[PDB]
Design a protein around this nucleic acid. Structure first.
Ligand code: ZN
Lengths: 50, 50, 188, 447
DNA sequence: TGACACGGACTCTACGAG
DNA sequence: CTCGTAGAGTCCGTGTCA
């Protein structure tokens, strides 16, 4: 919601969802690119964490 | 809503495109206003009272 | 209003989760920042969840109640009362099968105890700390044994086929899918 | 490394090629799809993709395959078998069209799996009563693995579960018979598939190591450049990942023959990716990149002017320093504000957060709902006070107690008198209601 | 914190079998 | 009677309230 004064207030789930979706898209592109094993491992680790 | 449109047609009530927001006195307090201050940002047209 | 009773709770099946959700959220954008209308098809998206303002689509093609069940062709937003924006759930199609933390770390580790495999091992597996030999064919290797990097390396070189080992939530899903519940119940 | 790792990749797949060649009847289908390839309806890279230790060159090499193969094929039944293994290693150079190896490796894998399913039901039978160590299972089962003889060899060792297996004698022989069918399609036994599979894995591992090196060599560089971008709302690890993507992109696109310093090219792409990612996915509300550059300029200018002047530069002074009309200056200042976390605790009262205050303006006021209800009731009865078809006219012209409103021509069609007379009716009704004492009660609804 | 409790893992003692 | 296994107790670390 836009609180009076041009600033915004959001629940944290917005940030969490944004981060998860980012890592998901990055992993998709990484698979399309056939990155070396180490990088796919790191990506899956971070996605699990998120 | 429709019925109110009917009412506007009937009485010819030009709807005012500006809502009221005035800072009215809080409920149940009564006293004397001793002073007023006005702060305009630089650039805007100072009103007479300023 | 229905008069109900008996609240039922169960694991959500993937087909049930797809059943509830009305759309997939592909991009992370939230709102247009110029006019704060929602971005499509972002975390806030009208063509998935619902119209911001009552009974008018996003693009502004249909604004009258005369249009109330029609779905604007330009903006894929259906015209309804904004309250629906409170009830529709969405979904994200996840690329890598991911483990549900609650069923893992809750003191009785139901992934752990279901697998009859210690907890420390499972944490090691999910975070890509070690492999696990998932049904290691005709070799000298167990089915729920965790393997370190160099153990898996000497093994792969040693055992090319009839050798299935994996890492992470994918391996865990593999291990879970193949388990025969009732036969093991009889044995136990 | 790209050419090196590609060579090792081809060497691994070449190893699987050798493994297949050392397997039987593979050479028959092999020569058949070489014959297919001769018509030239495909590419030279579906049959040879880099060697190990032109149509004519392939023709002559395959002529040598045919010759060595057949001459060892006649005397195949001792050393000629080792010569066939050598033919497998020399063909290792060639790789077959993806479909054919997919077909063979998948049929061989699923057959090994199927025999494994039979073996595992046997292993259930053994583990439940006799707990068979796997060594004896292999040794007795491996070596023949083709006829049901091993079954009676299990019967021959006098083991209690092994003899008891007659309960599953039907299924065991069904597995052996289908296994014989797989034998016929290959025309051999199995154990050599074990040899084949180990060589395939060895080759693939070689290729694996090469690909690993294709970043092990340029890894820490990404980390070194990454530590720059370390405060733009981005988990360090995401930064390093974006840098890895950029580095891979550079490597695959790197051109040593175009005349360009390699390292610069790499770092260039690294930045091109990292800055792009921070610009796009850093802020919650994505904002054009040129706008970000505008913010950066503003911030440099503010820093210089502030530290020299001491006080600060007023937006007018900033509008001076840059040629922009300053309307966009304050626009950019408004845009840069990040959303505040809705849970931020309010002062010394960690009981309420900010979320606890925001009010929902959407809600229609109950007062207004009551007014609207009273209004519909009153308008309905007052319409009832007026004539019938005029009342219906007025209801239809508006949405009173009805759905979408039809324009005058359509309502006139509804009465079949379709023309200005309908607005004559509208104006006459309005005129008739103008008279007071009926509408004043509705006059009250104005304010 | 801090008093409690639980779980998992580890150490020490005791019993059955050879 | 000792070795190998079984049982009991303890300790540490985590979860849980204000
Ligand atoms: Zn629209």
């Amino acid at each position: 919601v836009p609180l009076d004064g041009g600033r915004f207030a959001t629940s944290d789930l917005n940030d969490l969802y944004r981060r998860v979706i980012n890592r998901n898209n990055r992993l998709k592109r990484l698979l399309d690119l056939a990155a070396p094993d180490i990088i796919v491992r790191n990506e899956k680790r971070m996605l699990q964490e998120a | 809503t429709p019925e109110e449109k009917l009412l506007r047609a009937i009485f010819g009530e030009k709807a005012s495109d500006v809502k009221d927001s005035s800072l009215r006195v809080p409920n149940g307090v009564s006293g004397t206003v001793i002073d007023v201050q006005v702060f305009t940002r630089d650039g805007v047209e100072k009103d007479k009272r300023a | 209003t229905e008069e109900f009773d008996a609240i039922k709770i169960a694991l959500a099946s993937p087909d049930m989760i797809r059943s509830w959700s009305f759309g997939e959220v592909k991009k992370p954008e939230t709102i247009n920042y110029r006019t704060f209308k929602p971005e499509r098809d972002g975390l806030f998206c009208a063509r998935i969840f619902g119209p911001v303002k009552d009974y008018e689509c996003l693009c502004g093609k249909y604004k009258r109640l005369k249009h109330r069940g029609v779905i604007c062709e330009k903006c894929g937003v259906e015209v309804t009362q904004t309250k629906v924006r409170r009830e529709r759930m969405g979904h994200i199609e996840l690329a890598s099968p991911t483990a549900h933390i609650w069923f893992l770390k809750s003191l009785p580790s139901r992934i752990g105890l279901l697998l009859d495999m210690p907890l420390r091992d499972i944490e090691r597996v999910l975070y890509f700390e070690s492999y696990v030999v998932i049904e290691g064919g005709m070799t000298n290797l167990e089915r729920q044994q965790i393997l370190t990097e160099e153990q898996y390396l000497d093994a792969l070189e040693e055992f090319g086929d009839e050798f299935d080992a994996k890492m992470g939530a994918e391996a865990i899903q593999a291990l879970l899918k193949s388990m025969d519940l009732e036969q093991e119940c009889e044995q136990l | 490394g790209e050419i090196d790792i590609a060579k090792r990749i081809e060497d691994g797949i070449n190893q699987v090629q050798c493994s297949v060649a050392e397997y039987p009847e593979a050479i028959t289908y092999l020569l058949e799809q070489y014959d297919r390839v001769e018509a030239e309806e495909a590419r030279l890279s579906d049959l040879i993709t880099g060697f190990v230790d032109d149509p004519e060159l392939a023709r002559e090499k395959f002529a040598e395959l045919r010759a060595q193969y057949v001459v060892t094929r006649d005397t195949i039944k001792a050393t000629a078998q080792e010569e066939i293994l050598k033919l497998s290693e020399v063909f290792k150079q060639f790789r077959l069209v993806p479909k054919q190896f997919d077909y063979l490796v998948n049929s061989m894998r699923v057959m090994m799996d199927r025999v494994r399913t039979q073996e595992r039901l046997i292993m259930k039978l053994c583990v439940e009563q006799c707990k068979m160590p796997k060594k004896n299972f292999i040794t007795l089962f491996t070596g023949n693995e083709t006829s049901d003889t091993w079954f009676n060899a299990a019967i021959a060792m006098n083991k209690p579960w092994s003899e008891k297996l007659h309960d599953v004698s039907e299924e065991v022989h069904r597995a052996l018979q289908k296994l014989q069918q797989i034998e016929e399609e290959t025309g051999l036994t199995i154990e050599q598939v074990k040899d084949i599979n180990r060589r395939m894995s060895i080759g693939e591992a070689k290729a694996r190591r090469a690909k690993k090196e294709m970043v092990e060599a340029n890894l820490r560089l990404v980390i070194s450049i990454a530590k720059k971008y370390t405060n733009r709302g981005l988990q360090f690890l995401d930064l390093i990942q974006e840098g890895n993507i950029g580095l891979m992109k550079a490597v695959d696109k790197f051109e040593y023959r175009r005349g360009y310093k390699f390292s610069t090219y790499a770092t260039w792409w690294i930045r091109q990716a990292i800055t792009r990612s921070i610009a796009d996915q850093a802020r919650t509300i994505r904002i054009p990149v040129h706008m970000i550059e505008t913010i950066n300029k503003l911030n440099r200018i503010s820093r210089q002017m502030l530290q020299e002047m001491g006080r600060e530069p007023t937006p007018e002074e900033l509008a001076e320093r840059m040629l922009m009309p300053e309307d966009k200056i304050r626009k950019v200042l408004k845009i840069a504000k990040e959303p505040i976390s809705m849970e931020t605790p309010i002062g010394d009262d960690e009981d309420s957060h900010l979320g606890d205050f925001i009010e929902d303006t959407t809600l229609e006021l109950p007062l207004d709902s009551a007014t609207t209800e009273s209004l519909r009731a009153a308008t309905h009865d007052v319409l009832a006070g007026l004539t019938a078809r005029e009342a219906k006219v007025l209801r239809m012209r508006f949405g009173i107690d009805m759905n979408t409103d039809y324009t005058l021509e359509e309502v006139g069609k509804q009465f079949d008198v379709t023309r200005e007379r309908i607005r004559q009716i509208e104006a006459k009704a309005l005129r008739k209601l103008r008279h007071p004492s009926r509408s004043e009660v509705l006059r009250s609804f104005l304010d």
